[PDB]
Symmetry: D2
Subunit: 240 residues, 4 copies
C-alpha cells in the first residue's frame, strides 16, 4: 500500500491529481494507493472521495485548514497514528489574492502567507521527519511559473511562490541524503475555481487540471532511482 | 499520421525515445507515427529501426552528421521532399568532450560546438520554418543539467549546453506566436555509451535512458493547448 | 536635497551604507543628502547619526519596527510630512533565524516573515507610491545569495529571501514605467552582529560591511538613465 | 605595479574601462596600473593609449584578433615574456550579428562564435594558468543581459552569450580554490559603435559606456577578500 496525502484535493489541480492517481492504480496492478484527501471543505472531499473510490481506490478524507497550526498537527497525527508511514505528500493547497500593488491589504498578505508559506512549511517539516526515518518518500510542491517570474497584480502571490521555491530548494539538500524525491511542479494558467469568472475565449488560452495531474503521477511512478526535479507547464501561447 | 525526426536515434537517450514513441503508438490507438531516425552510424539505425517496427511503428532511417552543413541540408531536404511536413523534431544528437580546463584542445572545442551548437541551430532553423507555416509542431531539445550548472571538467561542454538553452529560449519567442511547442529536457547522469565504462557506483548512481524517454513521449501526447516547457531529471542522490 | 531612508541603519550593513553615503557627500559636493536613519534601537541610531554628521552629512533618526504596521505608517508619514518626497529607500532591515529543519519553531517563522516579508512589503508599497507620483526614485533591496541558493539551516531564511526576490521582480515591472530604479543587492557571508560569535579564522573568510556599502552608494550615484539592477558579492573563497 | 590586459580596448565599453582604470589611479597612490590594450585596429589602440597616458597611466598596445588562434598565442606570449605576471584580464572583446531567425547565416554563426566563445575560451585558458600559479588574479567577463534572457533577433547572439556564462560559471569552480576573482558584467543596451546608428531618442534610452566602466573598476579595487561576482546593468526604462 502506498500512503499518499494530497492537500487541496477538493478542487482544481489537487482534485485532478487525486483522480489521476486513482485511475493510474486501476491500470497499474502493483500500485495500490490509499488516497488521504484533505482541504477546508468536507463536502468537496466527500465528492472527490466518492469519485476516487468509483475508480477502485481506497480513500481517507480529513477536513483541515493548513493555515491553522492546530490542523497541521491533526493531519500529522492522523498519518502517524493511522498509517505510521507516508510515501507521498502533495503540497497542492494554496491561495491567491491579486490586485494592483496599491490595493493589496494586510489581510491579503496574511491570508496568502498563512497558507502558501506557513502551513506548507510546517506540514512539510512534520511529514518529512517520517520520510527521513523511512529513508524513502516523495514530496511534490505545486508552486507556479510565478515562483520564478513576476506579474503586475501578483506582488504578494509572487512573494509567496518564490518563497515556496526557497523551501523546495532547501528540502533538496535534506532529501538527497535520505533517499527522498523532491518534485517542483510549476504551471502557468490552469482553468480552475481559483480564477472564478473567466470568459469563454480566456478558457481556450488555459491548460486544464488533468494536464498537470498526468505528469505528477508519472513522476511518482518513475523508478526510485530517478527524480523528476522540476516540471514547467504553460499554455502553448504563453502566459496570459 | 505524425512525422517525427529523432537525431542521435542510434543509441542512448535518442534510441530510448524512438522506442518509447513506438511503444506508445502500440497502446495508444489513434497515434500513428512515422519515425524518421537519423544518426552517423547506419548500422545502429538498422537495429533500432527493427526494434521499433517490432512494436508496429513505421520507420525511415537516414544517415546524417549534423556537424556537416551538407548533411543538415540533406536531412532537411529529405523531410521537405519525402514528407513536406514535420510534426516533431527531437534535437537529441550531441557530443561531449571532457577534461581539466588546461587540457582541452581546439579540436575538443570545434567538435563539441559543431554538433551541439552549429548543427543543432541550423537543423532547427530549417525545420522550424516548416512548423511556422504549418502553425503546428513540437521541438524537443535534449540539453542537460549542465545547461544551468557548471562542472569542473565540463568547461566546453557547459559552454555548448548553456548555449543550447540560449537557442531554446529564443525559439520560445517565435513558437508561442505560431502554435508550436518547445520542450527543454534537462537530465543529470544517464547511463549511456556517452560515459563509456562504469562500475559499482556510476550505474547504481545514474538514471536509465528509458527514464528520460517516458516524459518526452508523454509531453508530446499532451493536448495541443499545453506545453511541457521544461523537464529536469536527476538521480535521486543528485549529481555525482 | 536627496532624501534617503535607510532601515536597519544601526548595525552591520545598514550602518555601513549610512556611513558610505555620508562620506560620498563629503567627496562629491554635488550630492546633498538627508540621511533618515531607522532601526529598533535608539542608542544605535544616535551613534551612527553622530558618525555621519562627523562626515558633514545631515541626519534624521527615527526608532521604528517595520514589522509593526503602525510604525510603517509612522515612517512613511514622517518622510512625507517633514520632507515631502523620497529619493532613495534602502530596504536593509532584516532578521535571520537558523537551525536544522526539525528545530525551527512557529515563532522562528513568524519573527522572520513579519520583518523580512511583511514589513518590507508594506514599507515598499507606501514609499513606492510616492516615487511613482514623482516619476523618480531608487529602491535598494538587500536580499542575499540565499535568495537564489539554499543552505541546510536556512529553510525559513531562504523562504524569506527568495520571497523578497519575488517582490523585487514585481517592483521592476512597476518601476520601469515611472523612472524608478530597483537594485537587488545579494551578499554572501558578511561579518556583522547577525552572525554573533567569531573566530579570526572564519572571520577572515567573510566580507566586511563596507565592501557591500561601496557598490550600493556607487549605484545610487549613477546617472538616472542607468540602473544597476543586481549586484552579487561573495567572499573570494565562496560560501562558508 | 598592476598588470591589466583589456581586450577590445579601442572602442565602446573596452575603451571606457581602460580610461576609468587610468583615472582611478589618481585616488589610489599605491595603485600603479600598466594597461595592456588590445583590439584588431592599431589606430584605435594608439588613440586610447594616448588618452590613458594623459591620465598618468602606463600603457602597452598590442594588435590582436582573438578569433585567430595564432594571435591568441602571440598575445599570451607577450604577457608571459614582457611581464611574466597578469593581475587582471578583462574579456571585453565581442561581436554581435542580429536578424530574424530565418535570415541568419553560417557566417553569422562562425563570426560570432569564433570571437565570443572560441577566442574568449582559449585566451582565458592560457592566462588563467598564470593566475592559478600566482594564486592571485581577477578575470572580468563582459557578457550581457542576453546571457540570461532571449531576444527575437538574437538567436545566435544569445547562444554565444549564454555560452559565455557557461564558461564563467565553470571558471568560478577553479577560481575559488586559487584566490582568483571572477566577475560577470551583464549590461543591457549601451550606446557604442556596436549599434552604429542612433536617433537621439534611441540614444536617450541607452546607458553610456562610462556607466559600465565605473562598476568594473570599483570591483577590481575591492579588497582581495571580496569578489563582486555579478553586476547587471540596464537602462532605467528597461530593454529596448
Ligand atoms: N490555477 C492556476 O492557474 C495555477 C497556476 C499555477 C499554480 N497554481 C497552484 O496550484 C495549487 C492549486 O491551485 P488551484 O487552481 O487548483 O486552486 P483552487 O481551484 O482554488 O483549489 C484550491 C484547493 O486548495 C485548498 N486549500 C487552499 N487553502 C487551503 C488551506 N489553507 N488549507 C487546506 N486546504 C486549502 C482549497 O480548499 P477549499 O476550496 O475547501 O478552501 C481547494 O481544495 C495552488 O498552490 C495554486 O497556487 C495554480
Ligand atoms: N548521458 C547523459 O548522462 C546525459 C546527460 C545530460 C544530457 N545528455 C544529452 O543527451 C543527448 C544524448 O546523449 P547520450 O548519452 O544518449 O549520447 P550517446 O549515448 O553517445 O548517443 C549519442 C547519439 O547522438 C548521435 N550523434 C552525436 N553527434 C552527432 C552528429 N553530429 N550528427 C548526427 N548524430 C550525432 C550519436 O550517433 P553516432 O554514435 O552514430 O555517432 C548517437 O546516435 C546529448 O545531447 C547529450 O548531451 C546526456
Ligand atoms: N550578514 C550577512 O552575512 C548577510 C548576508 C546576506 C544578506 N544579509 C542581509 O543584510 C541585511 C542586514 O543584515 P546585517 O548582517 O547587517 O544584520 P545586523 O547586523 O543584525 O543588523 C540588522 C539591522 O536591521 C535592523 N532591523 C532588523 N529588523 C528590524 C525591524 N523589524 N525594524 C526595524 N529595524 C530592524 C536591526 O535593528 P536592531 O538591532 O535595533 O533590532 C539592525 O539595525 C539583512 O536583510 C540581512 O538578511 C546579511
Ligand atoms: N553595446 C551594448 O549594448 C552591449 C550590451 C551588452 C553586452 N555588450 C558586450 O560588451 C562587449 C563590448 O561591446 P561594445 O558595445 O563596446 O562593442 P564595440 O563598440 O563594437 O567595440 C568592440 C571592441 O571589441 C574589439 N573586438 C571585437 N572582436 C574582436 C576580436 N575578434 N579580436 C580582437 N578584438 C575584437 C573591437 O575591435 P575592432 O573595432 O578593432 O575590431 C572593439 O575594440 C562585447 O562583448 C559586447 O557583446 C555590449
Ligand atoms: C502564474 C499565475 O498566472 C498563476 O499562478 C495564477 C493562478 N491563479 C490565478 N487566479 C487569478 N484569479 N488570477 C491570476 O492571475 C492567477 N494566476
Amino acid at each position: 500500500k502506498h500512503i499518499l496525502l494530497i492537500t487541496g484535493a477538493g478542487k482544481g489541480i489537487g482534485r485532478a491529481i487525486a483522480l489521476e492517481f486513482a485511475r493510474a492504480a486501476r491500470h497499474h496492478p502493483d500500485f495500490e494507493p490509499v488516497l488521504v484527501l484533505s482541504s477546508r471543505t468536507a463536502a468537496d472531499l466527500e465528492k472527490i472521495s466518492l469519485e476516487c473510490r468509483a475508480e477502485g481506490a481506497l480513500t481517507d478524507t480529513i477536513t483541515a485548514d493548513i493555515s491553522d497550526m492546530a490542523d497541521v498537527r491533526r493531519l500529522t497525527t492522523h498519518i502517524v497514528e493511522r498509517y505510521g508511514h507516508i510515501d507521498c505528500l502533495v503540497n497542492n493547497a494554496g491561495v491567491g489574492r491579486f490586485g494592483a500593488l496599491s490595493d493589496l491589504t494586510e489581510e491579503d498578505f496574511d491570508y496568502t502567507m498563512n497558507t502558501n508559506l506557513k502551513g506548507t512549511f510546517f506540514l512539510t517539516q512534520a511529514l518529512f521527519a517520517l520520510m527521513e526515518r523511512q529513508h524513502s518518500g516523495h514530496i511534490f510542491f505545486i508552486t507556479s511559473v510565478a515562483a520564478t517570474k513576476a506579474f503586475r497584480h501578483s506582488s504578494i502571490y509572487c512573494m509567496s511562490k518564490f518563497g515556496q521555491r526557497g523551501l523546495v530548494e532547501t528540502m533538496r539538500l535534506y532529501a538527497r541524503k535520505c533517499n527522498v524525491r523532491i518534485t517542483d511542479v510549476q504551471p502557468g494558467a490552469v482553468y480552475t475555481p481559483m480564477w472564478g469568472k473567466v470568459d469563454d475565449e480566456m478558457q481556450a488560452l488555459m491548460m486544464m487540471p488533468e494536464d498537470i495531474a498526468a505528469p505528477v503521477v508519472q513522476a511518482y511512478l518513475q523508478p526510485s532511482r530517478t527524480v523528476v526535479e522540476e516540471i514547467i507547464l504553460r499554455p502553448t501561447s504563453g502566459d496570459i
